[PDB]
Design a protein around this ligand. Structure first.
Ligand SMILES: *[C@@H]1O[C@H](CO)[C@@H](O[C@@H]2O[C@H](CO)[C@@H](O[C@@H]3O[C@H](CO[C@H]4O[C@H](CO)[C@@H](O)[C@H](O[C@H]5O[C@H](CO)[C@@H](O)[C@H](O)[C@@H]5O[C@H]5O[C@H](CO)[C@@H](O)[C@H](O)[C@@H]5O)[C@@H]4O)[C@@H](O)[C@H](O[C@H]4O[C@H](CO)[C@@H](O)[C@H](O)[C@@H]4O[C@H]4O[C@H](CO)[C@@H](O)[C@H](O)[C@@H]4O)[C@@H]3O)[C@H](O)[C@H]2NC(C)=O)[C@H](O)[C@H]1NC(C)=O
Ligand SMILES: *[C@@H]1O[C@H](CO)[C@@H](O[C@@H]2O[C@H](CO)[C@@H](O[C@@H]3O[C@H](CO[C@H]4O[C@H](CO)[C@@H](O)[C@H](O[C@H]5O[C@H](CO)[C@@H](O)[C@H](O)[C@@H]5O)[C@@H]4O)[C@@H](O)[C@H](O[C@H]4O[C@H](CO)[C@@H](O)[C@H](O)[C@@H]4O[C@H]4O[C@H](CO)[C@@H](O)[C@H](O)[C@@H]4O)[C@@H]3O)[C@H](O)[C@H]2NC(C)=O)[C@H](O)[C@H]1NC(C)=O
Ligand SMILES: *[C@@H]1O[C@H](CO)[C@@H](O[C@@H]2O[C@H](CO)[C@@H](O[C@@H]3O[C@H](CO[C@H]4O[C@H](CO[C@H]5O[C@H](CO)[C@@H](O)[C@H](O)[C@@H]5O)[C@@H](O)[C@H](O[C@H]5O[C@H](CO)[C@@H](O)[C@H](O)[C@@H]5O)[C@@H]4O)[C@@H](O)[C@H](O[C@H]4O[C@H](CO)[C@@H](O)[C@H](O)[C@@H]4O)[C@@H]3O)[C@H](O)[C@H]2NC(C)=O)[C@H](O)[C@H]1NC(C)=O
Ligand SMILES: *[C@@H]1O[C@H](CO)[C@@H](O[C@@H]2O[C@H](CO)[C@@H](O[C@@H]3O[C@H](CO[C@H]4O[C@H](CO)[C@@H](O)[C@H](O)[C@@H]4O)[C@@H](O)[C@H](O[C@H]4O[C@H](CO)[C@@H](O)[C@H](O)[C@@H]4O[C@H]4O[C@H](CO)[C@@H](O)[C@H](O)[C@@H]4O)[C@@H]3O)[C@H](O)[C@H]2NC(C)=O)[C@H](O)[C@H]1NC(C)=O
Ligand SMILES: *[C@@H]1O[C@H](CO)[C@@H](O[C@@H]2O[C@H](CO)[C@@H](O[C@@H]3O[C@H](CO[C@H]4O[C@H](CO)[C@@H](O)[C@H](O)[C@@H]4O)[C@@H](O)[C@H](O[C@H]4O[C@H](CO)[C@@H](O)[C@H](O)[C@@H]4O[C@H]4O[C@H](CO)[C@@H](O)[C@H](O)[C@@H]4O)[C@@H]3O)[C@H](O)[C@H]2NC(C)=O)[C@H](O)[C@H]1NC(C)=O
Ligand SMILES: *[C@@H]1O[C@H](CO)[C@@H](O[C@@H]2O[C@H](CO)[C@@H](O[C@@H]3O[C@H](CO[C@H]4O[C@H](CO[C@H]5O[C@H](CO)[C@@H](O)[C@H](O)[C@@H]5O[C@H]5O[C@H](CO)[C@@H](O)[C@H](O)[C@@H]5O)[C@@H](O)[C@H](O)[C@@H]4O)[C@@H](O)[C@H](O)[C@@H]3O)[C@H](O)[C@H]2NC(C)=O)[C@H](O)[C@H]1NC(C)=O
Ligand SMILES: *[C@@H]1O[C@H](CO)[C@@H](O[C@@H]2O[C@H](CO)[C@@H](O[C@@H]3O[C@H](CO[C@H]4O[C@H](CO)[C@@H](O)[C@H](O)[C@@H]4O)[C@@H](O)[C@H](O[C@H]4O[C@H](CO)[C@@H](O)[C@H](O)[C@@H]4O)[C@@H]3O)[C@H](O)[C@H]2NC(C)=O)[C@H](O)[C@H]1NC(C)=O
Ligand SMILES: *[C@@H]1O[C@H](CO)[C@@H](O)[C@H](O)[C@H]1NC(C)=O
Ligand SMILES: *[C@@H]1O[C@H](CO)[C@@H](O)[C@H](O)[C@H]1NC(C)=O
Ligand SMILES: *[C@@H]1O[C@H](CO)[C@@H](O)[C@H](O)[C@H]1NC(C)=O
Ligand SMILES: *[C@@H]1O[C@H](CO)[C@@H](O)[C@H](O)[C@H]1NC(C)=O
Ligand SMILES: *[C@@H]1O[C@H](CO)[C@@H](O)[C@H](O)[C@H]1NC(C)=O
Lengths: 126, 213, 97, 242, 269, 126
């Protein structure tokens, strides 16, 4: 079924993790007024690129869902699988992990370059 | 009931104990999910496990469960003192409803006893202004949770007016029961003495009083 | 299995409260008004022929209209828009007499 | 997550009806199911049914199909993730067997194979289907008595000798003192009437400085009583301590 | 995104159950007017009376009507315009001869509907001030012509209509129209102007406009004394109130799509 | 260890090839003045995209380190491995290969499309 942009707001993080390509979709394309238009037109690509920037300095240029090699520090959440994917919503979930998102991102940054520096060595010997 | 639990099981402290939850194919266990509750008498229950093995939030690792093709069970480890209570399971699926079993009490042993704190309160001056005459024999802080309240009257037991009750688990893992009995108001200065016996296994206690007040 | 791993999600439905420069939309009949008269209808982008507002089920949101921006933004847009219109319009300097 | 308070006890003569309410707080009411289970003596525990505050879907047992109706009220919100709703349960006919405890309990998860599984429970509601009329609780005091004359200990409390039906509160001075909070359950007389007492441990030295008010009520018929214990002792062992 | 409170009983502050995202707001036309606000979108069920702090008299009250109360306005004089060459290119538009009678600018509303709609606001007001309360209506206390009178544009000229006739009532616990006079200016000083002003050219001919009243900007008297007779008066001043009146449905949010969460999954070697 | 943006300036091309995700990081997010801000805000995304443009018309959208199929023309450098990775710095190294970087890029451009036109044939038969 097709709900709409942001339609799975109050949906469980499992059901909301279905409709990802819809929120990712309506995110780019869509003299007084003339200037408003221009610093809104750049703001949208700046804000968009800053996310692709992250996905790219991780390994997740795929993208949508992307697994990684940094293990989940229980201190961050510690909740069980069911009670976040089949229970909580992303609006809710965001505020819990909010305290360490940038610290989590740092774990990701080092881990990706570590992968690359390694994979060169594999293709080097083989 | 249809869902068959066990009657009672036992275990030491820092020990392990199990409990069955079997039933016919109409209820258990193939193509069916099973839950497990800690339901204290006269108090709200507590959910332990669901979907056979999934532990609820706020559940120590020691608690565990397994569903065989013919029977379901629950295993409890590292036996703590407060685990001494009554438990229930339930057959359920997504669309249908719950079907509670029969009932099982857990009897944890390897547990130290306790000397009873007895304090008898006789009837007040206002109570007799009805007129009705009774007594208030109360007993607390004892293990195991089982006693027998007896009485006497001139070298022979009492054959009327008895109202005895059961024990119950307290906030400090101990047990406490009460007992009352009615006497005629003309049996005060006329009858000499009267015993209020409450026997226990470790030692014996009693609160005897002779009406001359 | 016990060990969990973070996996990143792109396209998650979640928003933070904000402020930003919005932009105007008007309809074709506003430009059909011609006569060089309406203010800023021309620089203003058009509307949608089939507008859609997606209802978000199961969600609540804490509104406050007395601490909003897009009314302060609008109020401002209206004052500016108006004041830019008067630049070409003639000055009545000598009428003060 | 959030608490789930319920209505008080009440008596209803056989061949009548009843409605049990249950308020919601600290969680999104519409986000979880509401179940209702009874701890009747005869059949032990038994699940009546549940209802979704969101969709309104009801699934009752055959035992309560023709006999009961599930009711749910509108949700009024506190914040984006919190609300304040309520639910009810109309039992049409009343039998002898219906005499027992009643509980409301919300669902486990929002999605999954165990969506309606009763996770969070209420404190309980009581029902005594009986032909007998209501009886008020005749309250009386207790003459202070000691436990150990050497240990430096004393005790006193209130008595409620005859009433029907249960249950009864056990507060102290508008819920002030939280020391020695003790209580004994009632026992049934041969005629069909209950009887209970209560006591709290106190030190000997203080007599006039301590204030005795067991503000206790019996809600099934709107009865309020307050009593004070006098210093006239009973056992000689208490007056030696002074 | 812009989020839209679709709840038909919302006072503008707090949790809204019915919500929707949307790109653009609705068609919000910029009617700049004091006292009564006009041609705006109206409420769906009840006459909603919204304020920041209702208990505090210093804060105004935004009344949003349920039913439109049509108010007809006009300048009866067939005015004429001549053009004066300031030169070169500059040209002043003077006001020429008045063709016909010399009459008075005014506005009409139904006394019936005003009665009806002023009864609706009272039914709502008592929900905030008590069931056994008197709520009468009084005219402006005093101030600038910009605020002491219902100001608006009509056909290209600016109006200043005495609202004494509308706010002149009294309300206990339990077929002509209202002619209300107006004034007219040409050199205007709106939006609290200080260094610049604007001459609105004479609009040739006879002028009349027809409009609905969508709301009010009322003000309560702070004398109080716990009296069950707290009266109200029309206000204005700050023009953000008008856009506040239409934009109460909306809120702007920043979209953040990068979610991170644990699922039992490791990326390959 | 963490040096900082550009910290491995005077570090060997091996050690500088560790901290790549730091220079790649601080590269996007971070009326007189108003115009300055705007033609700086676009300049940064134009300049950024022009690099992603290259990585994408090669196979290296990964990215960081990316191996390829164009062999090293000794004429370009001819130095040994050790004396560039465990010796020279990128500031230095850049000026040597500077004379043919755009010619080298051209070798890359044809090689990628050649890969794609080929890989379709593999999935075609299989
Ligand atoms: C709340 O909302 C209400 C509702 O909108 C507001 O009421 C408005 O008030 C306006 C005034 O403030 C008013 O605008 C004026 O209307 C004058 C009357 O003539 C117009 O309207 C009639 C119908 O009422 C219409 O028949 C006329 O012409 C129609 O036909 C011609 C072709 O013959 C079309 O060109 C025209 O678009 C219109 O089309 C209609 O009919 C066809 C079918 O034939 C339909 O298919 C169409 O869909 C359409 O319905 C008139 O349009 C009018 O005389 C005024 O004109 C002056 O101002 C305009 C400004 O745009 C300018 O273009 C004109 O040329 C003229 O100004 C210049 O000329 C003067 C001399 O000619 C000169 O002196 C001036 O200085 C200028 O140089 C003006 O248009 C408006 O009509 C109403 N709304 C409605 C629905 O009637 C109310 O104001 C709001 N409240 C507040 C507080 O603002
Ligand atoms: C703010 O302004 C708005 C408008 O700007 C005001 O609202 C207006 O209010 C008036 C009344 O106050 C409304 O007029 C009404 O129109 C009714 C319908 O008339 C049409 O249909 C009939 C057939 O039923 C046609 O014959 C008519 O055409 C004839 O009349 C016109 C002139 O009106 C001529 O030009 C034509 O050539 C025709 O000859 C219309 O097309 C009408 O029923 C109603 O009352 C009539 O009937 C009663 C009896 O019930 C008579 O007593 C009365 O005198 C009227 O008689 C007219 O109609 C009969 C036929 O029914 C003819 O034979 C007569 O000769 C006579 O013309 C009334 O006239 C108008 O519709 C309405 N407009 C809007 C937009 O709301 C607001 O009140 C005002 N508010 C404030 C606060 O100021
Ligand atoms: C907003 O929030 C609310 C609350 O958070 C949320 O509502 C929850 O939605 C989830 C789904 O995402 C629900 O969970 C599912 O429930 C399914 C129920 O299955 C069926 O049977 C139900 C009971 O029927 C019994 O009784 C009747 C009569 O007594 C009898 O006839 C039956 O045989 C049976 O005995 C029935 O109520 C239910 O009805 C729904 O569906 C029918 C159409 O099928 C429709 O007509 C109804 O109007 C109603 O919508 C249904 O028929 C259950 O099947 C499902 O399990 C599946 O998923 C799990 C994994 O999730 C799998 O493991 C499993 O195998 C199944 O495939 C799941 O459990 C939950 O109950 C809701 N909770 C509440 C409180 O409403 C909304 O979805 C949210 N909305 C948004 C937009 O976010
Ligand atoms: C917004 O709108 C309000 C309300 O309309 C307006 O307030 C009114 O302002 C006017 C001034 O602009 C006040 O002045 C009144 O003017 C009338 C008209 O005068 C004619 O009639 C008198 C004789 O009555 C002639 O002398 C004169 O030449 C004109 O022909 C007067 O009639 C009013 O006078 C009354 O009060 C006098 C004092 O009591 C009496 O002596 C006189 O007879 C009038 O009768 C009143 O008193 C009688 C008993 O003595 C009683 O029986 C009558 O019923 C009546 O009550 C007066 O001078 C007018 O009072 C204001 N209205 C109110 C309700 O106060 C605002 O001014 C306007 N906003 C702005 C900015 O102007
Ligand atoms: C807002 O809208 C209102 C209408 O809702 C409108 O009010 C109108 O005001 C005028 C006055 O300007 C009213 O005209 C008369 O007002 C007098 C006022 O008398 C009072 O003051 C005198 C002293 O001056 C006192 O002696 C007296 O006791 C009053 O306190 C009224 O007395 C008039 O009414 C009399 O006649 C009626 C018809 O016969 C009787 O039914 C009524 O009971 C009154 O008789 C009383 O007074 C007599 C002496 O005058 C006495 O002998 C009797 O025994 C009895 O006691 C008259 O009303 C006008 O009527 C008001 N309108 C309406 C619909 O009533 C405002 O003007 C308006 N304001 C604006 C700004 O728009
Ligand atoms: C000043 O004030 C005036 C009013 O004095 C304003 O003018 C009015 O403006 C509004 C909005 O622009 C116009 O309304 C339009 O009406 C169109 C109607 O067409 C549709 O509706 C038909 C009927 O549908 C009803 O029945 C179905 C069942 O089949 C229901 O599902 C449906 O909900 C409707 O029921 C509703 O209405 C009835 C009354 O009719 C109620 O009793 C019900 O309780 C319920 O509320 C339908 O058959 C048809 O197919 C259409 O779908 C509508 O499309 C359009 O969007 C708009 O709403 C008025 O026409 C207009 N009136 C006048 C005289 O001008 C004015 O805008 C305002 N401002 C200014 C500046 O003047
Ligand atoms: C809508 O608006 C009304 C007011 O119009 C608000 O109602 C008031 O609410 C406040 C509490 O929120 C009530 O409490 C009062 O606060 C005063 C604070 O002023 C002191 O502090 C400031 C800090 O800068 C100083 O500048 C100032 O000089 C003061 O020192 C107190 O002054 C009040 O009196 C108390 O203090 C004095 C000594 O200073 C004592 O003598 C008094 O006995 C008393 O102890 C008082 O505490 C206030 O009473 C309310 N007023 C009314 C009229 O209701 C609403 O809160 C608002 N609504 C919302 C939603 O915000
Ligand atoms: C991460 O988990 C470990 C144990 O698994 C713990 O010691 C550490 O404190 C956690 N991290 C934080 C920031 O608390
Ligand atoms: C989470 O659920 C799984 C289900 O098997 C269980 O093994 C695990 O112990 C649970 N974790 C917690 C912290 O309850
Ligand atoms: C409202 O209308 C009625 C209709 O007769 C009128 O009598 C009444 O006076 C009006 N209301 C007020 C407050 O005057
Ligand atoms: C006022 O009284 C009416 C009587 O019908 C009642 O409906 C309403 O709720 C009451 N409002 C308040 C605020 O007391
Ligand atoms: C590349 O190397 C070959 C031999 O390996 C040489 O002939 C050729 O000249 C070199 N390229 C350039 C541009 O010198």
């Amino acid at each position: 079924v097709f709900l709409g942009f942001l339609g799975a707001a109050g949906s469980t993080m499992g059901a909301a993790s279905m409709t990802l390509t819809v929120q990712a979709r309506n995110l780019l394309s869509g003299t007084v007024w003339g200037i408003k238009q221009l610093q809104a037109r750049v703001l949208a690509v700046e804000r968009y690129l800053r996310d692709q920037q992250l996905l790219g300095i991780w390994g997740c240029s795929g993208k949508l869902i992307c697994c990684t090699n940094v293990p989940w520090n229980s201190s961050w959440s510690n909740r069980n699988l069911s009670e976040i994917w089949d229970n909580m919503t992303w609006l809710q979930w965001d505020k819990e992990i909010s305290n360490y998102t940038q610290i989590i991102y740092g774990l990701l940054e080092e881990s990706q370059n570590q992968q690359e520096k390694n994979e060169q060595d594999l293709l080097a010997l083989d | 009931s249809v869902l068959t639990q066990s009657a009672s099981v036992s275990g030491s402290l820092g020990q392990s104990v199990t409990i069955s939850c079997t039933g016919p194919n109409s209820v258990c266990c193939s193509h069916k999910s099973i839950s497990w509750y800690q339901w204290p008498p006269g108090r709200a229950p507590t959910l332990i496990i669901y979907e056979d093995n999934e532990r609820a939030p706020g559940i120590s690792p020691r608690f565990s469960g397994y569903k065989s093709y013919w029977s379901a069970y629950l295993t409890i480890s590292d036996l703590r003192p407060e685990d001494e209570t009554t438990y229930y399971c339930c057959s359920y699926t997504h669309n249908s409803g719950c079907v509670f079993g029969t009932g099982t009490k857990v009897s944890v042993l390897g547990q130290s006893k306790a000397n009873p704190s007895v304090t008898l309160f006789p009837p007040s001056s206002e109570e007799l202004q009805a007129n009705k005459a009774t007594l208030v024999c109360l007993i607390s802080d004892f293990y195991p949770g089982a006693v027998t309240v007896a009485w006497k009257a001139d070298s022979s037991p009492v054959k009327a007016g008895v109202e005895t009750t059961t024990p119950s688990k307290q906030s400090n893992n101990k047990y406490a029961a009460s007992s009352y009995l009615s006497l005629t108001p003309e049996q005060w200065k006329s009858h000499r003495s009267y015993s209020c016996q409450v026997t226990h296994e470790g030692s014996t206690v009693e609160k005897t009083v002779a009406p001359t007040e | 299995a016990e060990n969990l791993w973070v996996t990143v999600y792109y396209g998650v439905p979640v928003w933070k409260d904000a402020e930003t420069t919005l932009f105007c939309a008007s309809d074709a009949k506003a430009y059909e008004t011609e006569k060089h008269n309406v203010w800023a209808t021309h620089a203003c982008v058009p509307t949608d022929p089939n507008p859609q507002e997606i209802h978000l089920e199961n969600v609540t949101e804490e509104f406050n209209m007395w601490k909003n921006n897009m009314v302060e933004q609008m109020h401002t847009d209206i004052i500016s828009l108006w004041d830019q219109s008067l630049k070409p319009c003639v000055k009545l300097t000598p009428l003060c007499v | 997550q959030g608490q789930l308070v319920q209505s008080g006890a009440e008596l209803k003569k056989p061949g009548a009806s009843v409605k049990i309410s249950c308020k919601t707080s600290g969680y999104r009411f519409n986000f979880y199911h509401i179940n209702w289970i009874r701890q009747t003596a005869g059949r032990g525990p038994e699940w009546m049914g549940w209802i979704s505050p969101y969709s309104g879907d009801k699934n009752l047992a055959p035992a309560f199909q023709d006999r009961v109706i599930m009711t749910t009220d509108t949700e009024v919100p506190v914040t984006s993730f919190t609300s304040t709703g309520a639910a009810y349960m109309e039992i049409r006919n009343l039998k002898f067997d219906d005499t027992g405890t009643y509980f409301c309990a919300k669902g486990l998860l929002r999605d999954g194979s165990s969506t309606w599984l009763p996770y969070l429970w209420g404190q309980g509601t009581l029902l005594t289907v009986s032909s007998a009329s209501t009886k008020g609780p005749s309250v009386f005091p207790l003459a202070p008595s000691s436990k150990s004359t050497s240990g430096g200990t004393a005790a006193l409390g209130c008595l409620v000798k005859d009433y029907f039906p249960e249950p009864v509160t056990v507060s102290w001075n508008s819920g002030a003192l939280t020391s020695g909070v003790h209580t004994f359950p009632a026992v049934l007389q041969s005629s069909g009437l209950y009887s209970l007492s209560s006591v709290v441990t106190v030190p000997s030295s203080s007599l006039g400085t301590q204030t005795y008010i067991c503000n206790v009520n019996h809600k099934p018929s709107n009865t309020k009583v307050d009593k004070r214990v006098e210093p006239k002792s009973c056992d000689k062992g208490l007056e030696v301590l002074f | 995104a812009i989020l839209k409170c679709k709840d038909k009983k919302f006072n503008g502050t707090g949790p809204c159950p019915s919500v929707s995202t949307v790109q653009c707001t609705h068609g919000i036309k910029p009617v700049v007017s004091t006292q009564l606000l006009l041609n705006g979108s109206l409420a769906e069920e009840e006459v909603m009376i919204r304020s920041e702090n209702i208990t505090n008299n210093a804060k105004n009250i935004l009344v949003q009507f349920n039913t439109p109360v049509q108010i007809n306005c006009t300048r009866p004089n067939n005015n004429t315009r001549k053009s004066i060459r300031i030169g070169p290119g500059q040209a002043f538009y003077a006001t020429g001869d008045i063709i016909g009678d010399i009459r008075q600018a005014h506005c009409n509303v139904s006394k019936a509907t005003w009665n009806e709609t002023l009864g609706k606001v009272v039914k709502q007001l008592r929900k905030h001030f008590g069931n056994n309360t008197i709520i009468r209506f009084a005219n402006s206390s005093g101030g600038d012509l910009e605020v002491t009178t219902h100001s608006f544009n009509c056909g290209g000229e600016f109006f200043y209509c005495n609202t004494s006739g509308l706010f002149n009532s009294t309300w206990i616990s339990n077929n002509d129209s209202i002619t209300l006079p107006c004034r007219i200016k040409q050199i205007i000083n709106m939006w609290q102007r200080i260094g610049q002003a604007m001459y609105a050219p004479p609009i040739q001919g006879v002028i009349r406009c027809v409009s609905n009243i969508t709301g009010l900007i009322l003000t309560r008297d702070g004398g109080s004394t716990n009296s069950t007779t707290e009266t109200f008066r029309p206000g204005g001043g700050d023009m953000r109130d008008n856009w506040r009146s239409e934009l109460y449905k909306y809120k702007v949010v920043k979209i953040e799509p990068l979610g991170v969460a644990p699922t039992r999954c490791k990326r390959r070697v």
